[PDB]
Structure formats: structure tokens, C-alpha cells
Design an enzyme around this catalytic site. Structure first.
Site, PDB file in Angstrom:
ATOM      1  N   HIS A 142      -5.324  -5.231   3.632  1.00 33.54           N
ATOM      2  CA  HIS A 142      -4.584  -6.221   2.846  1.00 33.54           C
ATOM      3  C   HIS A 142      -3.453  -6.766   3.719  1.00 33.54           C
ATOM      4  O   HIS A 142      -3.275  -7.980   3.840  1.00 33.54           O
ATOM      5  CB  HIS A 142      -3.998  -5.562   1.582  1.00 33.54           C
ATOM      6  N   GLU A 143      -2.702  -5.862   4.345  1.00 30.33           N
ATOM      7  CA  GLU A 143      -1.586  -6.263   5.196  1.00 30.33           C
ATOM      8  C   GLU A 143      -2.021  -7.076   6.413  1.00 30.33           C
ATOM      9  O   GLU A 143      -1.433  -8.118   6.712  1.00 30.33           O
ATOM     10  CB  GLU A 143      -0.789  -5.038   5.667  1.00 30.33           C
ATOM     11  N   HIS A 146      -2.773 -10.642   5.734  1.00 27.98           N
ATOM     12  CA  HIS A 146      -1.630 -11.541   5.559  1.00 27.98           C
ATOM     13  C   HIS A 146      -1.372 -12.220   6.905  1.00 27.98           C
ATOM     14  O   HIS A 146      -0.971 -13.382   6.959  1.00 27.98           O
ATOM     15  CB  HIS A 146      -0.370 -10.779   5.132  1.00 27.98           C
ATOM     16  N   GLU A 166      -2.029 -13.756  -1.867  1.00 22.72           N
ATOM     17  CA  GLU A 166      -2.201 -12.368  -2.291  1.00 22.72           C
ATOM     18  C   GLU A 166      -3.655 -12.003  -2.577  1.00 22.72           C
ATOM     19  O   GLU A 166      -4.130 -10.955  -2.145  1.00 22.72           O
ATOM     20  CB  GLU A 166      -1.355 -12.087  -3.538  1.00 22.72           C
ATOM     21  N   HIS A 231       1.860 -11.504  -7.191  1.00 29.44           N
ATOM     22  CA  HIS A 231       1.055 -10.289  -7.343  1.00 29.44           C
ATOM     23  C   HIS A 231       0.464 -10.194  -8.748  1.00 29.44           C
ATOM     24  O   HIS A 231      -0.331  -9.300  -9.041  1.00 29.44           O
ATOM     25  CB  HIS A 231       1.881  -9.027  -7.065  1.00 29.44           C
TER      26      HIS A 231
HETATM   27 ZN   LIG Z   1       0.210  -8.830  -0.072  1.00 28.87          ZN
END
Ligand SMILES: [Zn+2]
Ligand SMILES: [Ca+2]
Ligand SMILES: [Ca+2]
Ligand SMILES: [Ca+2]
Ligand SMILES: [Ca+2]
Length: 316
Positions: A142-143, A146, A166, A231
Site C-alpha cells: 500500500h505504501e 503511494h 487511497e 480513507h
Molecule cells: Zn494510504
């Protein structure tokens, strides 16, 4: 640092043993020279100054409890790099093999992880709500995603473009989890969330409403908290992605699933070719439709399923 490439062994946050790529030069460092310009893992030593010190170990064995978060951050960053390279033909997050850096043991009892525009950062959690965050492959992916988004679409982290930002990270975080075949699911962060409670997670892509997140555009959050609900409203897009891949009937609309591989190809193309910094949900739908069209034809089942999925979550 300059040294000899070698392989060490350690134990991750969940107690699993795994091999990791290190570099030898007096000490053994968590520096993987086999992937692009390298993968570097640092020790933040419970401080907030970044990146901290490149992880150094005396014997190339990482079985100490203090080592666990570093072992997983280092290893999963490698798996994520492999995913983007092998599946999407992308070299690192910038497409030019940029070095990947991660710092673990950030602050004290920090219940979060993030990409700060230059590197990934992982807290150790408070032991109640979270255990070291790098222990979750979907969190790491996920990171790192980004970073991919920052170098491509550049979606602004606010309101609808932020929710898309997100969702993209949750989607690819999940696809990487499936890629590694590590007890894959459509839930987010289940491996490091609430060690005292089994079966739960931070977010759910299959059923966002399970944790109070919207699963239809009519239930979108319009407030100002969480940067306009980045989020929160991501749940609308996550549900759409889940439907495209797995299929199902949502709010009376039936969607024929086309599988995870095609889902990844469609969204990756949309992200790298059609999305812009200010894209909203409606523009994401157009981008996804156009991508599926480019890849499978305007009259394909793939295009049909993308339209049905977005209709299902109320995104026109
Ligand atoms: Zn995120
Ligand atoms: Ca050691
Ligand atoms: Ca899982
Ligand atoms: Ca998961
Ligand atoms: Ca739990």
C-alpha cells in the site's frame, strides 16, 4: 554502502523465517543490490528523525525481536518491487529503478505507516491496536504504491482525488498480497491489526460497510476530516474494484467478475495513462472504461463489467 552481496536469514514480525538480501562490509547491512538501484532499510531507533541509520548487523542473522520489523520491511519491499517489475514491467516506483528506502522503529508506539514523498516509514504500533506495521504485506505494498502514484497520476491527497489515491494503494496492496500468495484476502491490514482479535481488519474491500465505510456513492462522506475522507470514501472505489474482479450483485446491480489479473492491468493502465492530479470518481470511471477498451475492445466482457461495477456503486 559498497560491499559484497550476500544472503542472510531472519524472522519476521509474525515469527516466520525468511531469507533476505544483505550487503557485507565489516557489518552486514540491510541493503539489497539485486533489485534496481537497491533496497535500503534503516533503523529510526524510536526517534522521528529520518531516515536514521542504515541497518547494520554483526552476523547476518536477524532473529532478535528488535530485528523483526526490519526483516519484513526489507523483504516485502523486495516482493513489491518484483510484482511491479514482473507483472507490469515497471522498474521501481519511478519507472527508472529508483532506490527504495524504508525506516522502521519510527517514534514510540506509533500506530501507522506512511510514504513521506521520499521513503516509507513504519511505526511499531502500541501492541494493542497494531503490532509492527511492516508485518503486513498489504501495508507495505500500500505504501510503496503511494510512491508509484506520486510519480504517475500524482493524485492530490484530498477529497475525491485523494480517495482514489487511497483506493489505488489498497487495490495494489491486495494484488501484491495475492501475488505473494500469503494467506490472500480482500481485507486490509488483517495481519498486523488488533493482535487480540481474530478475523478483523482496518478496512474491507469485499464489504467496506463492515467497518462503517461507504459502499455506494450516495453514502459518501462530505465532511472535512481525514482530508475530506480519503480513507473513508476509498471504500466506494475498493468495492468497485472487488466487484470487477470477483463479481456479484450490489444494490441490485449484477457484475460478472473478470479476475484479479485483468483488474490489475486495467487499473495500472488507468493510473499511468489517464488519471491526473485532480481526477474525481467520475473521471476514474471514464479512465477505467477507456483502459479496458484499449486492452480488450469496446464490445468486450471486460468493458461491460467495468461499467456494471461503477453503476453498482453509483458512480456515473
Ligand atoms: Zn494510504
Ligand atoms: Ca544478528
Ligand atoms: Ca491476508
Ligand atoms: Ca489483506
Ligand atoms: Ca486482529
Amino acid at each position: 554502502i559498497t560491499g559484497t552481496s550476500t544472503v542472510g536469514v531472519g524472522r519476521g514480525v509474525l515469527g516466520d523465517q525468511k531469507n533476505i538480501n544483505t550487503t557485507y562490509s565489516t557489518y552486514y547491512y540491510l541493503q539489497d543490490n539485486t533489485r534496481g538501484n537497491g533496497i535500503f532499510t534503516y533503523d529510526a531507533k524510536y526517534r522521528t528523525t529520518l531516515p536514521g541509520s542504515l541497518w547494520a548487523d554483526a552476523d547476518n542473522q536477524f532473529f532478535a525481536s528488535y530485528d523483526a520489523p526490519a526483516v519484513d520491511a526489507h523483504y516485502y519491499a523486495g516482493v513489491t518491487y518484483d510484482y511491479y517489475k514482473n507483472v507490469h514491467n515497471r522498474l521501481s516506483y519511478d519507472g527508472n529503478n529508483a532506490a527504495i528506502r524504508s525506516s522502521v522503529h519510527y517514534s514510540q508506539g506509533y500506530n501507522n505507516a506512511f510514504w513521506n514523498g521520499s521513503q516509507m516509514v513504519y511505526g511499531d504500533g502500541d501492541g494493542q491496536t497494531f503490532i509492527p506495521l511492516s508485518g503486513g504485506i498489504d501495508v507495505v505494498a500500500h505504501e510503496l504504491t503511494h510512491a508509484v502514484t506520486d510519480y504517475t497520476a500524482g493524485l492530490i491527497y484530498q477529497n475525491e482525488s485523494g480517495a482514489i489515491n487511497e483506493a489505488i494503494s489498497d487495490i495494489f496492496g491486495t494484488l501484491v498480497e495475492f501475488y505473494a500468495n500469503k494467506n490472500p484476502d480482500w481485507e486490509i491490514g488483517e495481519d498486523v491489526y488488533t493482535p487480540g482479535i481474530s478475523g478483523d481488519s482496518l478496512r474491507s474491500m469485499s464489504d467496506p460497510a463492515k467497518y462503517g465505510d461507504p459502499d455506494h456513492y450516495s453514502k459518501r462522506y462530505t465532511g472535512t476530516q481525514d482530508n475530506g475522507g480519503v480513507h473513508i470514501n476509498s471504500g466506494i472505489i475498493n468495492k468497485a474494484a472487488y466487484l470487477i474482479s470477483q463479481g456479484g450483485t450490489h444494490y441490485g446491480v449484477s457484475v460478472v467478475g473478470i479476475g484479479r489479473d485483468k483488474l490489475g492491468k486495467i487499473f495500472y493502465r488507468a493510473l499511468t495513462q489517464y488519471l491526473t492530479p485532480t481526477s474525481n470518481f467520475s473521471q476514474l470511471r471514464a479512465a477505467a472504461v477507456q483502459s479496458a477498451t484499449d486492452l480488450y475492445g469496446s464490445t468486450s466482457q471486460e468493458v461491460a463489467s467495468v461499467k456494471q461495477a461503477f453503476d453498482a456503486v453509483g458512480v456515473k
